[PDB]
């Protein structure tokens, strides 16, 4: 069934699972033409596929060439996503294949189900959660590899850096989602928060700064405040 607030710890058990998010797969800028009409120009995108227990992220880069000469791109994007996720599963040894794939938008269920007909034992699930994975292109290093790509490409990351050496996957996923929610609500502020103190750096093999335990508490509180405050103004408290 659908994933929601009540079956939330299931993400962190020992059944292999992936989140797939397609919100950054087909990306465009809208502009005016010389004749005063409007036109889009596509830019590179990415499939965001994440194992919430290990942090492993499989970032499939979608180069703009894949849209050349195609119609109904928004619809093709969902099928392209399903095609790539299916190739990913097939590339993995059986014992690493997921038992579930949770899609963050219901429009993806049918494209993924059809592409996964060969894996009847892999459950394709929606979710009721409003997860912020769309803000993944606000993470500087992820944006940079997507925009620099000149051909299709898969890049592998650990989106929790080394956090699991000190925190549980439940705590890690809660941190990640707070950081991404913050980045989605107010990117500038969220980023100022993360980098204000220039003495806390991002290792070359990491995505986020090397905060201490106590510094993460302060950071986490600052991201909660920022998220609070636009709920303190969007519904006129």
């Amino acid at each position: 069934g659908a994933m929601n607030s009540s079956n939330y710890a299931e993400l962190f058990n020992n059944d292999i699972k992936l989140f797939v998010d397609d919100t950054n797969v087909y990306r465009v800028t809208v502009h005016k033409t010389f004749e005063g009409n409007v036109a889009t120009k596509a830019i590179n995108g990415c499939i965001f596929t994440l194992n919430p227990k290990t942090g492993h992220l499989f970032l499939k880069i979608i180069h703009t060439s894949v849209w050349a000469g195609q119609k109904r791109l928004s619809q093709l994007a969902k099928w392209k996503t399903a095609e790539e996720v299916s190739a990913l599963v097939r590339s993995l040894p059986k014992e690493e294949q997921p038992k579930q794939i949770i899609v963050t938008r219901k429009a993806m269920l049918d494209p993924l189900e059809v592409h996964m007909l060969d894996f009847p034992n892999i459950a394709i699930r929606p979710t009721e959660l409003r997860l912020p994975f769309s803000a993944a292109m606000s993470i500087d290093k992820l944006s940079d590899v997507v925009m620099k790509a000149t051909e299709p490409q898969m890049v592998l990351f650990n989106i929790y850096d080394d956090w699991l050496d000190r925190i549980s996957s439940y705590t890690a996923f809660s941190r990640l989602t707070l950081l991404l929610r913050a980045l989605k609500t107010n990117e500038e502020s969220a980023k100022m928060i993360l980098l204000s103190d220039p003495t806390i750096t991002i290792k070359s093999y990491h995505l986020w700064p090397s905060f201490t335990d106590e510094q993460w508490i302060t950071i986490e509180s600052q991201m909660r405040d920022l998220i609070l405050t636009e709920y303190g103004r969007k519904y006129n408290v």
Partner: protein, 300 residues
């Protein structure tokens, strides 16, 4: 013209013969139905006055034998049987006609309804869907489940309709996942028409037989099958022009005949709105769309 005599009518029952239905009282002197048109299949069917639950009935063709109905008080139902002694059968029928204890199949001469509803239905194909090879006629009732329904429990008493599943390897060619799911022409034309049904007549015959079992017995799996087969055509971009035109005629009579008060349980809102308004064939069912919009605009 042919006759189906009844040994007697011991229990109060509503009897149906195709679209005509009449009330018979407990031990009324009723001895059968005469003047039944030769050349078509037929369905006789019963609803006991005591138990509106379980409408059931028998498909048959009068060319395949002499058939009669007889109540069984152990099993509690009107049973169809075959009389092999042809002299005995003519003698019985004649006596009952002379004494005028038979109702007449009441066909108006202008009316092509039954033909239009059974055009492609053949007894030989019915007997393959309803497996019971020792009888020339076929029993159906409200509760019988389909082969696809049993996959999702008694396989002997099932409706073996052709399985259609839009999210199946059969439906979907590797490497055309998107193309084949959004435009089912491959599944319709190659898998089903050329592969399984052989021709569109056989396809239409199963479709009419599914509708008829849905309408007369409220056989839920039959209704599911009818909508599936309509949807497979409507969701195919490439359909022979002769099939489209015939499909519009088929559906038209089905909707014309469908009882108005069972339209909420026998019509699937989603399938119809999709077929009439979104599908490739949204402009190809003029008669069906015209009758649907004047009779059931609530569904749309």
């Amino acid at each position: 013209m042919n006759t189906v005599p009844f040994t007697s009518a011991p229990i109060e029952v509503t009897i149906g013969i195709d679209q005509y239905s009449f009330n018979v009282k407990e031990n009324q002197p009723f001895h059968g139905i005469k003047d039944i048109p030769i050349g078509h299949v037929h369905v006789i069917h019963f609803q006991h006055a005591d138990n509106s639950s379980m409408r059931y009935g028998y498909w048959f063709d009068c060319r395949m034998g002499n058939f009669y109905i007889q109540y069984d008080p152990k099993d509690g139902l009107y049973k169809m049987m075959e009389e092999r002694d042809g002299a005995k059968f003519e003698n019985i029928v004649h006596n009952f006609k002379e004494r005028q204890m038979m109702v007449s199949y009441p066909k108006i001469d202008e009316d092509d309804t039954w033909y239009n509803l059974t055009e492609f239905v053949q007894m030989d194909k019915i007997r393959k869907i309803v497996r019971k090879d020792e009888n020339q006629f076929s029993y159906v009732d409200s509760s019988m489940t389909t082969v696809q329904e049993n996959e999702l429990s008694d396989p002997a008493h099932s409706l073996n309709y052709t399985v259609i599943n839009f999210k199946s390897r059969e439906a979907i060619r590797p490497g055309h996942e998107m193309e084949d799911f959004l435009d089912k022409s491959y599944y319709l034309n190659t898998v089903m028409l050329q592969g399984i049904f052989k021709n569109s007549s056989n396809y239409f015959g199963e479709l009419q037989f599914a509708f008829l079992n849905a309408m007369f017995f409220g056989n839920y799996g039959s209704s599911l099958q009818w909508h599936a087969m309509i949807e497979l055509i409507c969701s195919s971009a490439t359909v022979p022009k002769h099939m489209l035109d015939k499909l519009d005629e088929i559906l038209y009579y089905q909707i014309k005949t469908l009882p108005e008060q069972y339209s909420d349980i026998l019509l699937n809102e989603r399938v119809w709105n999709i077929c009439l308004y979104s599908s490739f064939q949204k402009n190809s069912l003029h008669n069906t769309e015209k009758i649907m919009e004047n009779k059931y605009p609530e569904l749309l």
